[PDB]
Amino acid sequence: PKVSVIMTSYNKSDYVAKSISSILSQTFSDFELFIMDDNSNEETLNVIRPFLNDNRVRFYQSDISGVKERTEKTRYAALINQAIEMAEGEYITYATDDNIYMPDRLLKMVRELDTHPEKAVIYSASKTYHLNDIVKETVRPAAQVTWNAPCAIDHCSVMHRYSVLEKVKEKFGSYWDESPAFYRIGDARFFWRVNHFYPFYPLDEELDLNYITEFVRNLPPQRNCRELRESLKKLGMG
Ligand SMILES: O=c1ccn([C@@H]2O[C@H](COP(=O)(O)OP(=O)(O)O)[C@@H](O)[C@H]2O)c(=O)[nH]1
Ligand SMILES: [Mg+2]
Ligand SMILES: [Mn+2]
């Protein structure tokens, strides 16, 4: 396949079917979808089950159980790293169990990378609807090329060439950072690694949507956004 979509899942039974359906109905259909379930409860696994009949889905379930194992590593970074090692696509993109892709997301992002060989990482705008009907609507624009993506751009709004993963692994030893000190902001920490070598190019369209309507005590102190952002400003790549 041209694209590898990597989705992480953990106990969001009321949302995961809408997320998976949004990917399977994409107008660009040449992808493989990894569904990396982190050993969710029965209700969630039963919602996911029928989607395993789609021949593009590659379903993996971890054996993770209990607070020690849940807090040893940033779990979605570990699962994304596992999927990357099995990925066959030229372009890599990410999805979560509570985010929805707009129907033309893959077509438009693939076209941006096919059309501009000089771009290696692209990001789109993102929208969040607050329900209570809609009480609030938030948009995260994609209006400029940026060398400082941490906490400005979400996990679910990006697509990049597989070759980006090579450069990152050469300097850092892994793709995503599995250290549990970056649990709250794992996507930002991966973007911080990518931003040592590549800027993020904007695609000014809202292509992903979010609907908002013992574990925490066993994590190490959480590093923050300001730390990553200041570190890149200091790095001075743009
Ligand atoms: O033990 C866990 C907890 C979460 N996740 C996944 O991590 C991603 C980010 O999680 P969450 O939505 O809880 O984070 P937030 O929205 O706070 O960034 C989601 O795909 C979850 O399914 C996971 O794989 N294992
Ligand atoms: Mg987040
Ligand atoms: Mn979430």
Side-chain angles (χ1 to χ4, degrees), residues 12 96-98:
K12 293 188 186 99
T96 56
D97 54 355
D98 52 7

Coordinates of all heavy atoms in Angstrom, one line a residue, residues 12 96-98, ligand 3:
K12 N -12.3 3.0 24.4 CA -13.2 4.1 24.0 C -14.3 3.5 23.1 O -14.6 3.8 21.9 CB -12.5 5.2 23.2 CG -11.5 6.0 24.1 CD -11.0 7.2 23.2 CE -9.9 8.0 24.0 NZ -8.5 7.6 23.5
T96 N -6.5 8.1 16.1 CA -6.8 7.6 17.4 C -8.3 7.1 17.4 O -9.1 7.4 16.5 CB -6.6 8.7 18.6 OG1 -7.5 9.8 18.3 CG2 -5.2 9.1 18.7
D97 N -8.6 6.5 18.5 CA -10.0 5.9 18.7 C -11.0 7.0 19.0 O -12.2 6.6 19.0 CB -9.9 4.8 19.7 CG -9.3 5.3 21.0 OD1 -8.8 6.4 21.2 OD2 -9.3 4.5 22.0
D98 N -10.7 8.3 19.1 CA -11.7 9.2 19.4 C -11.6 10.4 18.4 O -12.2 11.5 18.7 CB -11.7 9.8 20.8 CG -10.3 10.3 21.2 OD1 -9.4 10.4 20.4 OD2 -10.1 10.6 22.4
Ligands
MN3 MN -7.9 11.6 23.4

